[PDB]
Design a protein around this ligand. Structure first.
Ligand code: 4UX
Ligand code: CL
Ligand code: CL
Ligand code: NA
Lengths: 99, 99
């Protein structure tokens, strides 16, 4: 699909058995989701944005379905105000910016 | 052009006759750039991101070139960690997300 940017590019994701709304965010290196449980090992990480840093849990090799396209990669979990799909998973679904 | 997301989507912008690097950011509603002087009056705004909120100066109707495409619109100036081109000017340059 082609998504225009008049409005926030929100899509439905499926992660950890749950449906969530998330923002397709080319300015995010990493995918960051609101607090939830995920299986397997994790390690702590700090990630910074506008406003400073938050502490997150880093889970590797997590499968997500993004607008119907499956991808696997690292997912950061913590107190983000918005669920964000970052470049680490946008590449896997073949997303590009075009102008 | 078609920009893939394996690396950060950085482009050259020109504002006040100066070249700067900035990130094409579909997760940003608004364009915000690091401290610089812009002409005219400004109005207050708060923008929130991953770590919380910052105060910025809002300048309207600023001429800015983005990857060679001319735009004229609102630029926020404040302590952002990186220059970000958000959806208000991405729509002016005709950008879409595609997958
Ligand atoms: C530096 N780590 C960063 C980079 O990679 C990592 O992945 C996740 C984080 O990325 C980010 O937070 N990306 C943001 C851009 C941004 C901000 C600061 C620095 C770089 C990029 C976002 O793309 C845009 N942000 C709203 C998101 C969180 C809903 S906003 O806070 O900046 C914003 C920018 C304008 C406006 N008008 C309002 C908010 C880590
Ligand atoms: Cl990854
Ligand atoms: Cl590719
Ligand atoms: Na894992």
């Amino acid at each position: 699909p082609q998504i225009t940017l008049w409005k926030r590019p929100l899509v439905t994701i499926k992660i950890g058995g749950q449906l969530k709304e998330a923002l397709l965010d080319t300015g995010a290196d990493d995918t960051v989701i609101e607090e939830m449980s995920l299986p397997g090992r994790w390690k702590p990480k700090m990630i910074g944005g506008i406003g400073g840093f938050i502490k997150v849990r880093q889970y590797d090799q997590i499968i997500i379905e993004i607008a119907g396209h499956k991808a696997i990669g690292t997912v950061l979990v913590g107190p983000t105000p918005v669920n964000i799909i970052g470049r680490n998973l946008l590449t896997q679904i073949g997303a590009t910016l075009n102008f």
